[PDB]
């Protein structure tokens, strides 16, 4: 689960440019007309506030960051390997709500000593 | 014909022989059943250089690593040739009327673009996405 | 025909022997009543040859690991011959007019697209799932 | 026929003696008013050969566990092999005028695709859920 | 008629006397003002013989625990009976003309659909819910 | 007509005397001027025997405990024979010609369904709720 | 032609030979069938002048650093040239009829622009990126 | 001529001699095969003034800092002009029917608007942006 989080926020976690060229139902350009499109909108060589100026027939979409709950995904994980070894769930850098407190943590404490 | 259509650039057509040439036009003239005889010899050579230079300049390259020319080249080369024939001949026929006989073809309503315009366009076509721009790139 | 359709690719086709080829002409040819007779050998050789041609370019390969040709790969290629013809014979009637006697057929609204625009074209759509995109891959 | 036409693959038909076939055909003949007498027998054999064929491998199998090919399969095939020779004849005719008579048929606007094109399509369309996609898959 | 178009089979027509036969035959030809008595009697066999299959093929079954053929089974066979001979015959006609003489007819094109297309499908479809999908199932 | 065609049912119209039948059939013809004089016995009879089978079959029972046949069940019966003596006459004329003499009847785009084809059907159709799904039911 | 017209700006047309520009206007008559031979010399000049002028001035520089004129710039400047001198003519026939003899061309419905308005600039607009606008750049 | 077109304003014209204005008239007689040889040259003087005029006064200027006549200024004022002789003449002719020959051109549905309205109009547009609002300005 680790290993899929990591993975996960590389493609999912960042925005991606999207440069479509051409009109739809237009006509088509090839990989060579692309590779010309490309130098000019490379993530590379673009700075914070480099302006575009365009035809009509240039569309700059986004890949937007996907949202997915990754920080959930960590907890629940944390919560099963502690259970399993044992430790409170407080050993692997997770909070659980109402059992910080009051006699929930008297017996989880006690449990552990 | 010896030299195929798709195996000559528009630099080869002008250097064939007049037997090379005549072969090739030959058979872009099986593509129709009237041959196109009332059109002359150097109307035919034009269509077939003017296609040839066509493939060559609109038709070449790739598209996410496919080549755009996805069918047989050489079908497709004569495809165009017969496609640029029928259009120094005015067109394609819709209707035809003479001594009293008429027809009428089912042609009509295509689309308003160049290979759209004619039978043999229309199977030039299918030889080349359609016209579809499936091209794709990354940045490294 | 001993050789059937489907067993000949482009290449096999030119080195069949004239009756062999003959064979099949004489098989397309049964697909119209009026069998093309006014038109010449070689433009229904030119067209089963690029039907041929574009079988094995066009209409070959996989969707989904299935075969783009799902149906009969002979009568597909018949098919896609009898369109070929049709199209050099200068397309579909929809009315004919002669001495006196008419006769008007349900042909038109039939789309677009080369294979739509002949009946023989709309039977070949069926054997290779009507154009559509099935295609799909995963990573591993 | 003692061999039904649904009894019949495309290996059996051309295994079939002469008289068997021309009971097969015999019965095509009853599905038109003018029997096609006018088409000869080789195409009324090509038809329904097609027929055969284009039964076996595109209307075969199944979704959802049911029979691709719900209705009488004698029928079925009977109906394709006549909508085949109505379309080797140049189509469905929409309008006839001869000397001074005249009739025209309710016929248009039945969509683009072959089977609805005449009505015999139509008819076989009824037993192959009208080309509709009712399959269903699990994982288990 | 003593065996109804209803308590047969098509495996029972088979079987049927020729008399038999012919008193069902006769009742169909009731449904027209004109008995299409320029068709032949095989043409009509056919045509009953093919509603009592697709009667027993595409009509039988049940909806909801309701029986998909609602109304009186007698009269909805005779009905695709004759919407059978009327396709036979061509098809039903918009307009004819003669010596000076003319009528058109309200057929209007109702639908599409293979029973939509003649006077005789359109007073079939009431007896089956008009094709509509009224099933329904639990699980337990 | 003494047995009125409302109180007779398929069963009973088989067992009425020639004479019972045939004031019932002269209670039809007067729904048109022309008597559909041309059209034989038989035919009428066959109608007004359908209309009753359909009557009993399709346009009976309740809808919310209302009946379906809301109007005067004679005159529904007798509009419903009508309807299938005009549809066995090949339908309700739109225009007819003859000697110089023109007639056009504002009968068109009267709608798709059997009974929405010819004013006989149009009349029954209001008897009949005009088709609606006014049917409603509890649990208890 | 030893200069070609690709090679030829409009000033260099004016310095050619006389048989020089013969040659370019002989190549510019093999697009139509007709050679438009009831055009005297001047009008072709014109045209062939124009068309290297607007060449030069209307499809010249840069879109994304891309050529706009992609296509073969000989044929482009011969189908442009053509273009011109059918609009001379009047425009493209639709229709044409005279004694006794008709012909119509499927033409119509391309669109309301310059070049959409014949064969010869549509075939042109394919060698020009179909006059869209696929220009980009960047702030340094 | 040499005073070209686009070298000469209002003013310029009215004080260039009868034979420097008559090399300007004879080209613009060059984009028409007629001539315009039925209308005097008053007319024909009259609608180059005006051209000139409506180049000066219409087409001038600058839109982003572009010149709004972006094409060769030559022939957009020999355009200009042609389309105003033609406006002269009553207009495009869409028909021309004579001594039994007929011709129909493409022309129509080409827009609501002056320059739309003719061939050399429409020819004219694709030197001025088309009519379109290009212009831009900042504030300091
Ligand atoms: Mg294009």
Known sequence: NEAAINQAIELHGFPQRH????????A???????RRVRTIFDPRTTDANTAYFTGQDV?????????????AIHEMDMRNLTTALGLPLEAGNVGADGLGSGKPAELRFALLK | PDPSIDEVSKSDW?????????????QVENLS???????????????????????????????SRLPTLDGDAEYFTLYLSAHKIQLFEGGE?????????????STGGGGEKDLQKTRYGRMALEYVWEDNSIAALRTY
């Open chain 1, 19 to 26: 440069v479509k060229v051409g009109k739809e139902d237009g």
């Open chain 1, 28 to 34: 088509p350009v090839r990989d060579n007309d692309l």
């Open chain 1, 59 to 71: 569309d700059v979409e986004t890949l937007e960051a996907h949202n997915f709950d990754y920080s």
């Open chain 2, 14 to 26: 002008d250097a064939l022989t007049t037997q090379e040439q005549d072969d090739i036009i030959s």
């Open chain 2, 33 to 63: 059943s009237t041959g196109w005889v009332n059109t002359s010899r150097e109307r035919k050579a034009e269509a077939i250089r003017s296609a040839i230079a066509e493939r060559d300049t609109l038709y070449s390259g790739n598209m």
């Open chain 2, 93 to 105: 026929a819709q209707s035809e009327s003479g001594e009293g006989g008429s027809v009428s073809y």
